């Protein structure tokens, strides 16, 4: 119970912990209905608006006013933000020319530059194009500070998952907020945007910035604001907090605006009606900077201007209905809109038939505007499966469309695949720790938690950022990364056997400098493997998993594609370097009527026939479904060369991935669940390829002087091509479309393989970390 009869005198927006039976005066009290009876009258003053006028300058201090224009207001830290402009002849911050802030210019008492996070909901990255005509203050922050052309949110591209990701550095599947709405089958309880269930701490995992700060003795302002508190009051409160005594003043602050998300939904992102909310936000930014300038803090504070996701054109007329596909939609619950999650209406309903539902949802209309996925089949880049709150059945909805259960106020929405252009949001950093007038490549919001920790002198809790990959955004306070140490050193075995030693059922009728350009990948777990050299490729062959962990080769721009001769079609030769006991056998493949096999280094690209024979080794062989082989062969035969021609050579590294429990991490042997029939050859869940070349395309891959260029993929190893609706046609009609959807970061592959790439290069380790987090989106 809360004794509401208490008072908020001298307590407005206080930062100290206060809980029942005591009554509260913090920015969250309304949300708990636990405010003192006089909170509104004493703390939410509104009288006379938010701006000084000339007829108010040097007034007698009246406590009834929202903000003040009296002589003493400055030291007391509660002037209206435009006080000195109206009353003391000063200029607005936005009318001042930019000057590089080479070091913090903070008043005495300030040990570190404070950090203010200014988050805007639904701010599409492309809104920034509207420039200073519409958003002069924001434009100044962007042009004078450090900005990215856009920032990639996490999927689903909705508010709660993204704000909590920002706060924690974690994927939703890790922090637990996997949607604005969700059902937890263990709680048997439902979380909603609106309502009280969300206030239960049991939903919220990881460790958000404010907790990290607090636990390391750094004071945080309260990040959250009750929706009824006007933005002008949030700003004044932050400014007041910054005016607090040295022993009370917080170091990190957060402002939040629900705009332009609201207007985006109502009018769509390209509506002329969008200009007005963008103007309002800029005005609020202006109040903040005017306020900091008045406090002599405008060259002391680090400001981060950041969105949670973008906004797409979505109207009533573009809605798919499950009732068009399924007979009994009243028996399922659908989490609807710009994504789909399906479960039975009655939890654990035994008649629920997901294979049948998926079958009715698969490629049933030629223009079908969604695609069903078992969650383990979703592109790995989304990192959206390893949580009990994520339904097994998912629908990835096409941009601009909605999915509903069964049969216009809105013109905009968001939620789609996070590589979609319209979902990208904004990042600008301005202040002494950020660089001056610097543009940086786009990056993912999971990286920001580490940077904010760096900005505040904190040690980050475990998270999914790659600490160091964003050092290039900072003047100082950078993080010196250290290379992880190799766990398993490789055997280099010479010949120890002869062809006569092998009973496998197989019948056949200066490498490094040229094929391993960035050093060998380090193995970061306990295991046993052999380096194998060949004329055209090198490989790290695992004696445990009976295949390479990686095969590495370089294809020159001018290199030639050859065929596999008819008599070599089914040729597999044993490898005298590797024990018969540590080899696969072709008999398992003959017996397994469903599983075929493939080669990591493509015979099609060997230099000479004597080299071709290297490719057919039993140690270059991997288990592949015929369905997948359609994809792989086309990749090996047509695409690698096309990449080599367009990029002036490519270095390729390919290999298997085992992720049977879909946690995005390298499986241990115990977790692998499928083997080639009658054998112990484990079946990969995915195959990756990492394609690297020179950023300066005028130099060949093998002779690159400077920065690298990378694209990668993690292809699902599946027994059919159901995901590809046009798979019945020629591979030139569908394979690349599939590969684009499964684009990936090198970092993703590192998590899934336990390997560490690019250890030997001429680049800084920080620059390399940036490279590993890059995602080629094809947008
Ligand atoms: C992204 O980055 C994150 C953070 O680094 C990584 O996630 C981590 O993964 C590791 C490895 O699996 C996990 O370690 C295991 O920890 C458990 C117990 O850990 C408990 O305490 C810690 C610390 O306080 C909490 O962070 C954990 O919180 C999880 O569970 C709670 C309650 O359900 C939930 O509220 C949180 O959101 C979070 O859930 C997420 O993780 C769990 C798995 O823990 C997952 O089931 C869920 O769906 C969410 O994904 C938790 O309360 C410990 O028992 C394990 O021990 C194992 O190793 C020992 C070795 O001695 C074995 O003997 C034993 O048998 C186990 O195998 C692990 O140490 C860690 O929890 C987890 N952290 C978080 C916050 O998720 C991701 O892997 C990264 N992703 C990628 C792709 O890189
Ligand atoms: O004051 C706030 N209101 C938030 N909302 C989202 C959720 N709703 C949904 C209705 C209300 C409003 S988040 C929020 C503050 C906040 C929360 C997290 C982060 Cl990372 C930052 Cl910078 C700011
Ligand atoms: C709820 O709040 C009121 C006001 O703070 C409390 O009233 C005070 O109670 C003490 C002790 O009984 C009196 O001596 C004071 O005169 C009261 N103060 C005022 C200004 O009313 C009340 O005690 C609280 N109710 C509880 C504790 O249940
Ligand atoms: C999948 O779609 C088929 C139709 O394509 C559904 O079967 C129809 O509905 C009922 C129940 O099976 C039958 O009486 C009709 O004869 C079927 N119509 C046709 C055209 O065959 C089936 O119900 C759907 N499956 C699910 C799980 O929704
Ligand atoms: Ca795994
Ligand atoms: K076979
Ligand atoms: Na198909
Ligand atoms: Zn949002
Ligand atoms: Zn929204």
- Other residues' Cβ atoms within 10 Å of the Cβ of residue 496: 10
Buried b (16+ CB within 10 A) or exposed e, 273-306: ebbebbeebbbbbbbbbbbbbbbebbbbbbbbbb
Task: Specify whether 288 is located in the same domain as 315.
Answer: yes
Contacts of 717 (CB under 8 A, 6+ apart): 624, 625, 628, 683, 684, 685, 686, 687
Task: Specify whether 666 is located in the same domain as 743.
Answer: yes
Q: Are the CB atoms for 28 and 226 separated by under 8 Å?
A: yes
**Which residue has a Cα nearest atom 11 of ligand 2?**
227
Name the region of 89 (left: φ>0; alpha: ψ -120 to 50; beta: rest): left
* Ligand 2 and 224: CB distance under 6 A: yes
Tell me the CA–centroid distance for residue 720 and ligand 4, in Å.
Answer: 23
* Ligand 1 and 464: CB distance under 6 A: yes
Choose among 423, 375, 422, 425: nearest CA to 396: 375
| CATH label of the domain that carries residue 71 | 4.10.410.20
Q: What is the DSSP string of 265-325?
A: HHH-TT-GGGHHHHHHHHHHHHHHHHHHHHTT-TTT-EEEEEES---EE--TTSEEEGGGT
State the Cα–Cα distance between residues 516 and 767, nearest whole angstrom: 19
Query: Which one from 2, 159, 633, 773 is the annotated catalytic residue?
Result: 159
Q: Evaluate the CA torsion angle 285, 288, 293, 294 in order and state its sign.
A: positive
Residue 685 burial by CB count (10 A; 0-12/13-18/19+): exposed, middle or buried?
A: buried
Q: Is 413 annotated as a binding residue?
A: no
Choose among 52, 451, 481, 122: nearest CA to 266: 122
Estimate the crossing angle of helix 275-294 against helix 231-242, to 10 degrees. 20
State the Cα–Cα distance between residues 415 and 405, nearest whole angstrom: 17
State the Cα–Cα distance between residues 433 and 103, nearest whole angstrom: 8
What technique determined this structure?
X-ray
Choose among 554, 534, 550: nearest CA to 488: 550
Would you call 510 helix, strand, or coil by DSSP?
coil
Tokens of 686: 């995915």
Tokens of 726: 């046009």
CA-based radius of gyration for the chain: 30
Which of 327, 330, 331 for mutating ligand 4's site (highest number of atoms within 8 Å of CB)?
A: 327
State the Cα–Cα distance between residues 626 and 594, nearest whole angstrom: 8
State the Cα–Cα distance between residues 487 and 523, nearest whole angstrom: 6
**Which residue has a Cα nearest atom 80 of ligand 1?**
464
Q: Are the CB atoms for 572 and 613 separated by under 8 Å?
A: no
Q: What is the DSSP string of 754-766?
A: -EE---S-SS-HH
The most distant pair of C-alpha atoms in the chain lies apart, rounded to whole Å, by 104
Residue with tokens 């974690």: 170
CA 509 to chain centre: 50
Tokens of 284: 């609020």
* Ligand 1 and 665: CB distance under 6 A: yes
Q: Evaluate the CA torsion angle 753, 754, 760, 762 in order and state its sign.
A: positive
Choose among 237, 11, 32, 1: nearest CA to 116: 237
State the Cα–Cα distance between residues 144 and 97, nearest whole angstrom: 9
Q: Is 503 annotated as a binding residue?
A: no
Estimate the crossing angle of helix 746-753 against helix 765-773, to 10 degrees. 90
CA 651 to chain centre: 26
84-90, long-range: CB within 8 Å, 24+ apart, which pairs? 84/293, 84/294, 85/52, 85/290, 86/51, 86/52, 86/53, 86/54, 86/56, 86/57, 87/52, 87/54, 87/56, 87/57, 87/58, 90/293, 90/294
Task: Specify whether 456 is located in the same domain as 491.
Answer: no
State the Cα–Cα distance between residues 707 and 646, nearest whole angstrom: 17
- Other residues' Cβ atoms within 10 Å of the Cβ of residue 240: 17
Q: Are the CB atoms for 482 and 520 separated by under 8 Å?
A: no
Q: Evaluate the CA torsion angle 554, 538, 687, 152 in order and state its sign.
A: negative
Buried b (16+ CB within 10 A) or exposed e, 744-762: bbbbbbbbbbbbbbbeebe
* Ligand 4 and 326: CB distance under 6 A: yes
Q: Which residues surround ligand 7, an ion (CB under 5 A)?
A: 721, 724, 727
Tell me the CA–centroid distance for residue 305 and ligand 9, in Å.
Answer: 18
Q: Are the CB atoms for 441 and 150 separated by under 8 Å?
A: no
Q: Is 265 annotated as a binding residue?
A: yes
Closest atom of ligand 4 relative to the 328 alpha carbon: 28
Choose among 590, 488, 602: nearest CA to 549: 488
Choose among 223, 232, 219, 251: nearest CA to 78: 232
Give the start-end residues of each E strand in 55-207.
115-121, 146-147, 151-152, 182-184, 189-191
Q: What is the DSSP string of 403-452?
A: EES------EE--S-TTSGGG-B-EEEESTTBPSSEE---EEGGGHHHHH
User: Which helix (H) or strand (E) segment is 255 a member of?
Assistant: strand 252-260
Task: Specify whether 382 is located in the same domain as 302.
Answer: yes
Task: Specify whether 390 is located in the same domain as 486.
Answer: no
Tokens of 742: 């499964």
Q: What is the DSSP string of 151-177?
A: EE-PSS-SHHHHHHHHHHS--HHHHS-
What ligand is nearest to the CA atom of residue 589?
A: 6
State the Cα–Cα distance between residues 305 and 142, nearest whole angstrom: 9
State the Cα–Cα distance between residues 367 and 157, nearest whole angstrom: 24
What ligand is nearest to the CA atom of residue 380?
A: 1
Number of structural domains in the chain: 4
Task: Specify whether 401 is located in the same domain as 446.
Answer: yes
State the Cα–Cα distance between residues 447 and 663, nearest whole angstrom: 19
CA 697 to chain centre: 28
Residue 64 Cα distances to 44, 46, 80, angstroms: 10, 8, 14
Choose among 706, 710, 666: nearest CA to 685: 666
Task: Specify whether 499 is located in the same domain as 413.
Answer: no
Tokens of 136: 């002069």
Choose among 235, 410, 246, 393: nearest CA to 318: 410
Residue 510 burial by CB count (10 A; 0-12/13-18/19+): exposed, middle or buried?
A: exposed
Residue 736 burial by CB count (10 A; 0-12/13-18/19+): exposed, middle or buried?
A: middle
Nearest-10 Cα torsion for 731, 732, 737, 739 = 60
Which of 163, 172, 453 for mutating ligand 2's site (highest number of atoms within 8 Å of CB)?
A: 163
* Ligand 1 and 462: CB distance under 6 A: yes
| Domain assignment of residue 9, given as a range | 1-44
State the Cα–Cα distance between residues 451 and 460, nearest whole angstrom: 9
- Other residues' Cβ atoms within 10 Å of the Cβ of residue 402: 24
* Ligand 3 and 3: CB distance under 6 A: yes
* Ligand 4 and 132: CB distance under 6 A: no
Tokens of 583: 């080899």
- Other residues' Cβ atoms within 10 Å of the Cβ of residue 54: 8
260 preceded by a cis bond (ω within 30 of 0):
yes
Contacts of 683 (CB under 8 A, 6+ apart): 595, 623, 672, 674, 675, 676, 717
Tell me the CA–centroid distance for residue 438 and ligand 5, in Å.
Answer: 39
Task: Specify whether 75 is located in the same domain as 168.
Answer: no
Q: 691 pairs with which residues across the strands?
A: 652, 711
Tell me the CA–centroid distance for residue 156 and ligand 6, in Å.
Answer: 39
Residue with tokens 């078992």: 374
Tabulate helix, strand, coil % of the chain (nearest 5): 30, 20, 50
Q: 554 pairs with which residues across the strands?
A: 651
What ligand is nearest to the CA atom of residue 719?
A: 7
Q: Are the CB atoms for 516 and 536 separated by under 8 Å?
A: no
Structural domain ending residue among the three candidates 444, 479, 514: 479
Q: 743 pairs with which residues across the strands?
A: 713
Choose among 779, 758, 242, 225: nearest CA to 520: 758
Contacts of 237 (CB under 8 A, 6+ apart): 13, 27
CA 107 to chain centre: 37
- Other residues' Cβ atoms within 10 Å of the Cβ of residue 617: 25
Tokens of 300: 């002391």
Known catalytic residue at 159: yes
* Ligand 1 and 310: CB distance under 6 A: no
Tell me the CA–centroid distance for residue 6 and ligand 3, in Å.
Answer: 8
Tell me the CA–centroid distance for residue 184 and ligand 6, in Å.
Answer: 42
State the Cα–Cα distance between residues 774 and 13, nearest whole angstrom: 42
* Ligand 3 and 36: CB distance under 6 A: no
Contacts of 565 (CB under 8 A, 6+ apart): none
State the Cα–Cα distance between residues 344 and 332, nearest whole angstrom: 4
Task: Specify whether 466 is located in the same domain as 489.
Answer: no
Give the start-end residues of each E strand in 322-401.
332-335, 339-344, 370-374, 393-397
Q: Is 536 annotated as a binding residue?
A: no
- Other residues' Cβ atoms within 10 Å of the Cβ of residue 683: 20
Q: Is 313 annotated as a binding residue?
A: no
What ligand is nearest to the CA atom of residue 9?
A: 3
State the Cα–Cα distance between residues 597 and 624, nearest whole angstrom: 5
177-186, long-range: CB within 8 Å, 24+ apart, which pairs? 177/203, 177/204, 178/384, 178/387, 178/389, 178/390, 179/335, 179/341, 179/389, 181/335, 182/335, 182/389, 183/333, 183/343, 183/347, 183/389, 184/388, 184/389, 185/347, 185/348, 185/388, 185/389, 186/388
Q: Evaluate the CA torsion angle 412, 415, 420, 422 in order and state its sign.
A: positive
Which of 223, 234, 426, 451 for mutating ligand 2's site (highest number of atoms within 8 Å of CB)?
A: 223
Would you call 65 helix, strand, or coil by DSSP?
strand
Q: Are the CB atoms for 152 and 418 separated by under 8 Å?
A: yes
Task: Specify whether 301 is located in the same domain as 412.
Answer: yes
Tell me the CA–centroid distance for residue 544 and ligand 2, in Å.
Answer: 49
| CATH label of the domain that carries residue 635 | 3.40.570.10
Q: Phi and psi (nearest 5°) for 363?
A: 45, 50
Q: Are the CB atoms for 384 and 378 separated by under 8 Å?
A: yes
Would you call 357 helix, strand, or coil by DSSP?
helix
**Which residue has a Cα nearest atom 14 of ligand 4?**
327
Residue 305 Cα distances to 11, 210, 301, 479, angstroms: 29, 18, 13, 22
* Ligand 2 and 256: CB distance under 6 A: yes
User: Which helix (H) or strand (E) segment is 627 a member of?
Assistant: helix 626-634
Would you call 550 helix, strand, or coil by DSSP?
strand
* Ligand 1 and 195: CB distance under 6 A: no
Tell me the CA–centroid distance for residue 714 and ligand 5, in Å.
Answer: 14
Cα-based angle 292, 253, 465 (whole degrees, multiple of 5): 125
**Which residue has a Cα nearest atom 26 of ligand 4?**
326
Choose among 738, 651, 641: nearest CA to 687: 738
Task: Tell me the resolution in Å.
Answer: 2.0
Q: Are the CB atoms for 770 and 441 separated by under 8 Å?
A: yes
Q: Which residues of the chain come before a gap where C and the next N are over 2.5 Å apart?
A: 407, 509
Residue 94 Cα distances to 237, 286, 298, 749, angstroms: 21, 7, 11, 45
- Other residues' Cβ atoms within 10 Å of the Cβ of residue 237: 21
Q: Are the CB atoms for 612 and 572 separated by under 8 Å?
A: no
Bridging pattern class, strands 115-121 and 650-657: unpaired
Q: Are the CB atoms for 42 and 65 separated by under 8 Å?
A: no
Q: Are the CB atoms for 676 and 592 separated by under 8 Å?
A: yes
| CATH label of the domain that carries residue 191 | 3.40.720.10
State the Cα–Cα distance between residues 306 and 309, nearest whole angstrom: 9
- Other residues' Cβ atoms within 10 Å of the Cβ of residue 119: 21
Task: Specify whether 350 is located in the same domain as 244.
Answer: yes
Task: Specify whether 458 is located in the same domain as 492.
Answer: no
Bridging pattern class, strands 621-624 and 596-599: antiparallel
State the Cα–Cα distance between residues 447 and 438, nearest whole angstrom: 18
**Which residue has a Cα nearest atom 11 of ligand 4?**
327
Measured in residues, the chain has a length of 779
State the Cα–Cα distance between residues 573 and 509, nearest whole angstrom: 9
State the Cα–Cα distance between residues 51 and 86, nearest whole angstrom: 9
Secondary structure letter of residue 93 according to DSSP: G
Tokens of 694: 């020179």
Contacts of 724 (CB under 8 A, 6+ apart): 734, 735, 737, 738
Contacts of 659 (CB under 8 A, 6+ apart): 380, 665, 666, 667, 685, 686, 752
């Amino acid at each position: 119970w809360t004794n509401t009869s208490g008072s908020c005198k001298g307590r407005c927006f206080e930062l100290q912990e206060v809980g029942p039976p005591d009554c509260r005066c913090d920015n969250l009290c309304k949300s708990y209905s636990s405010c003192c009876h006089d909170f509104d009258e004493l703390c939410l003053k509104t009288a006379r608006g938010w701006e000084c006028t000339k007829d108010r300058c040097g007034e007698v201090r009246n406590e009834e006013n929202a903000c003040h224009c009296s002589e003493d207001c400055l030291s007391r830290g509660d002037c209206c933000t435009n006080y000195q402009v109206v009353c003391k002849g000063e200029s607005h911050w936005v009318d001042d020319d930019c000057e590089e802030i080479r070091v913090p210019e903070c008043p005495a008492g300030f040990v570190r530059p404070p950090l203010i996070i200014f988050s805007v909901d639904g701010f599409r990255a492309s809104y920034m194009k509207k420039g200073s005509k519409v958003m002069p203050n924001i434009e100044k922050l962007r042009s004078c500070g450090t900005h990215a052309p856009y920032m990639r949110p996490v999927y689903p591209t909705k508010t709660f998952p993204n704000l909590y990701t920002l706060a924690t550095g974690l994927y939703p599947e890790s922090h637990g907020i996997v949607g604005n709405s969700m059902y937890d089958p263990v709680f048997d309880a439902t979380f909603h945007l609106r309502g009280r269930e969300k206030f239960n701490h049991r939903w919220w995992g990881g460790q958000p910035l404010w907790i990290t700060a607090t636990k390391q003795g750094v004071r945080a302002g309260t990040f959250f604001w009750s929706v009824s508190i006007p933005h002008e009051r949030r700003i004044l409160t932050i400014l007041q907090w910054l005016s607090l005594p040295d022993n009370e003043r917080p170091s990190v602050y957060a402002f939040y605006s629900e705009q332009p998300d609201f207007s985006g939904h109502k009018y769509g992102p390209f509506g002329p009606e969008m200009t007005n909310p963008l103007r309002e936000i800029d005005k609020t930014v202006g109040q903040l900077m005017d306020g900091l300038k008045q406090l002599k803090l405008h060259r002391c504070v680090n400001v981060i201007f950041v969105g949670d996701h973008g906004m797409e054109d979505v109207t009533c007329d573009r809605t798919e209905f499950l009732s068009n596909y399924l007979t009994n939609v009243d028996d399922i619950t659908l989490v609807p809109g710009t994504l789909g999650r399906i479960r039975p209406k009655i939890p654990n309903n035994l008649k629920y038939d997901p294979k049948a539902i998926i079958a009715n949802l698969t490629c049933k209309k030629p223009d079908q505007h969604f695609k069903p996925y078992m969650k383990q089949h979703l592109p790995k880049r989304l990192h959206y499966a390893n949580n009990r709150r994520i339904e097994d059945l998912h629908l990835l909805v096409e941009r601009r469309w909605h999915v509903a259960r069964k049969p216009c106020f809105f013109q905009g929405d968001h939620g789609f695949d996070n590589k979609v252009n319209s979902m990208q949001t904004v990042f600008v950093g301005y202040g002494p720790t950020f660089k001056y007038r610097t543009k940086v490549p786009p990056f993912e919001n999971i990286e920001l938690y580490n940077v904010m920790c760096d900005l505040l002198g904190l040690k980050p809790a475990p998270n999914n950022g790659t600490h160091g990959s964003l050092n290039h955004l900072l003047r100082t306070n950078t993080f010196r990364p250290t290379l992880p140490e190799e766990v398993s050193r490789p055997n280099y075995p010479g010949i120890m056997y002869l062809q006569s030693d092998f009973d496998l059922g197989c019948t056949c009728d200066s490498t490094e400098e040229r094929h391993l350009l960035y050093g060998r990948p380090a193995v970061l777990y306990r295991t046993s493997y052999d380096i194998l050299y060949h004329t055209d490729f090198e490989s790290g062959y695992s004696e445990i998993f009976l295949m390479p962990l990686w095969t590495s080769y370089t294809i020159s721009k001018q290199a030639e594609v050859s065929s596999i001769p008819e008599h070599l079609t089914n040729c597999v030769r044993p490898d005298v370097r590797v024990s018969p006991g540590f080899s696969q056998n072709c008999l398992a493949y003959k017996n397994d009527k469903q599983m075929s096999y493939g080669f990591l280094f493509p015979p099609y690209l060997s230099s000479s026939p004597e080299a071709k024979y290297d490719a057919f080794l039993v140690t270059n062989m991997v288990p592949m479904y015929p369905a997948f082989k359609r994809v792989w062969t086309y990749f090996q035969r047509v695409l690698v060369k096309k990449y080599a021609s367009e990029r002036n050579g490519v270095n390729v590294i390919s290999g298997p991935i085992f992720d049977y429990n879909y946690n995005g991490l390298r499986d241990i042997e115990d977790e692998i669940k499928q083997y080639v029939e009658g054998s112990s050859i484990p079946v990969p869940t995915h195959y990756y390829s990492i394609i690297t070349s020179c950023l300066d395309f005028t130099q060949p891959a093998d002779k690159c002087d400077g920065p690298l260029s990378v694209s990668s993929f993690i292809l699902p190893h599946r027994p059919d091509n159901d995901e590809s609706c046009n798979s019945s046609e020629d591979e030139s009609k569908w394979v690349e479309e599939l590969m684009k959807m499964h684009t990936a970061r090198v970092r993703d592959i590192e998590h899934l393989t336990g390997l560490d790439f690019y250890r030997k290069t001429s680049r800084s380790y920080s620059e390399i970390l940036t490279l590993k987090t890059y995602l080629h989106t094809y947008e």
